[PDB]
């Protein structure tokens, strides 16, 4: 492969809320954190205060927070990295991901930008199973199962 | 492994322009195209008209267009950037050079007019480079020495 996917950056308004939820939901473990930045990093992410590299499966997730006064929601209309899709290994795991989401939502340990619950697990013309959930930032994750 | 990254969705306001730039810049190939959607898809992406799966490297990109507000918003929670690892320092130079070649070609329109950053080196020799796609979305190229 000419290149390889390395990490996705997740910008949040509440880093500690996101870190806790990502660890419990995805099983992320922390590889490092950073609070001192290059000029270049600060020019791409003005006001960044803390950055953490998380890891789950093959996925690296850099979660960071920038100094801000307000806490806006995501804007659905604008060009964007709109969703991230993870593949599961069985229809049973799809149900488990859905149940685990509701369990974390009902636990009262996290704040969520949106009130929206998970979709049902749906099947398409080819047997593919789909599930969409939102992280605590209102960002969309898709779970899929490929027969 | 509990799960595996499958694809990233990129939402655009001009699908044709994105398809061309992603193909030329990343070497993507169009695996398939779709213009008929399930009720679930239409509920998550109201107004979606066309969806395309592109493949480059070990990455699947689902580029899609809904209704023809431009410009990403920088302050909101978001998937803020995607980082791709390269194989050599010379390839970092190449990615920068090829970004500029495409930008200056006139073949594409860009939401923002910002050029690529310099290539910078951290205390461990790791190289970083940032560019924007035609939608103004950020791509990071890195090189991590052995
Ligand atoms: Fe998707
Ligand atoms: Fe990054």
Short mmCIF file of N, CA, C and O and ligand atoms in Angstrom, two decimals, chain A residues 83 85 132 142, chain B residues 7 62, ligand 1:
data_model
loop_
_atom_site.label_atom_id
_atom_site.label_comp_id
_atom_site.label_asym_id
_atom_site.label_seq_id
_atom_site.Cartn_x
_atom_site.Cartn_y
_atom_site.Cartn_z
N UNK A 83 -18.85 10.16 9.28
CA UNK A 83 -19.00 9.00 10.14
C UNK A 83 -17.79 8.10 9.98
O UNK A 83 -17.03 8.22 9.02
N UNK A 85 -16.88 3.93 10.28
CA UNK A 85 -17.55 2.64 10.28
C UNK A 85 -16.61 1.55 10.76
O UNK A 85 -15.51 1.39 10.21
N UNK A 132 -26.18 2.43 13.79
CA UNK A 132 -25.58 3.75 13.98
C UNK A 132 -25.80 4.19 15.42
O UNK A 132 -26.92 4.08 15.94
N UNK A 142 -20.77 3.99 12.79
CA UNK A 142 -21.54 2.94 12.13
C UNK A 142 -20.90 1.60 12.47
O UNK A 142 -19.69 1.43 12.33
N UNK B 7 -14.52 1.87 7.04
CA UNK B 7 -14.51 3.00 6.12
C UNK B 7 -14.79 4.30 6.88
O UNK B 7 -15.29 4.29 8.00
N UNK B 62 -15.98 6.57 1.68
CA UNK B 62 -17.34 6.68 1.15
C UNK B 62 -17.65 8.16 0.94
O UNK B 62 -17.98 8.86 1.90
FE1 LIG C 1 -21.01 4.22 6.15
#
